[PDB]
Amino acid sequence: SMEQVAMELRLTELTRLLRSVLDQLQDKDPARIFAQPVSLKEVPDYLDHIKHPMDFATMRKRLEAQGYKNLHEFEEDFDLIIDNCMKYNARDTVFYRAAVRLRDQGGVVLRQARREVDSIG
């Protein structure tokens, strides 16, 4: 149907916008602390602590399969990155501090992405 195609073009366009958001958020992590999944070889107890691990590479895989239907889903995954780190790591660590900085810097990016998603439809 033409309607199914139109819906597919919208998903494609949302995918484009989310890729640009993802790039901008990941620039706010120049240490690449959140680039890859926490290694279960190096942190063997991690899944006893954190039930839904998340990282930028895993988001990027989802994004490229057009697996985010809306901005809310993408923000949920970004929030898991931050929130997981802030639970596993103590306040006095470079990890926790990186998460706070990412949260604070990313909020600005996400605020204008929400306006763009709404605006363009």
Q: How many CB atoms lie within 10 A of CB 84?
A: 21
CATH label of the domain that carries residue 16 = 1.20.920.10
* Structural domain containing residue 44: 1-121
Which DSSP helix (H) or strand (E) runs through 64? helix 56-64
Resolution of the experimentally solved model in angstroms: 1.8
Name the experiment that determined this structure: X-ray
Distance separating alpha carbons of residues 67 and 110, to the nearest angstrom: 18
Contact 46, 40 (CB under 8 A): yes
**Domains contained in the chain, number:** 1
Could you tell me which residues come within 8 angstroms of residue 58 by beta carbon, excluding any fewer than 6 positions away?
37, 77
How far is the first Cα of the chain from the last one, in angstroms, to the nearest whole number? 21
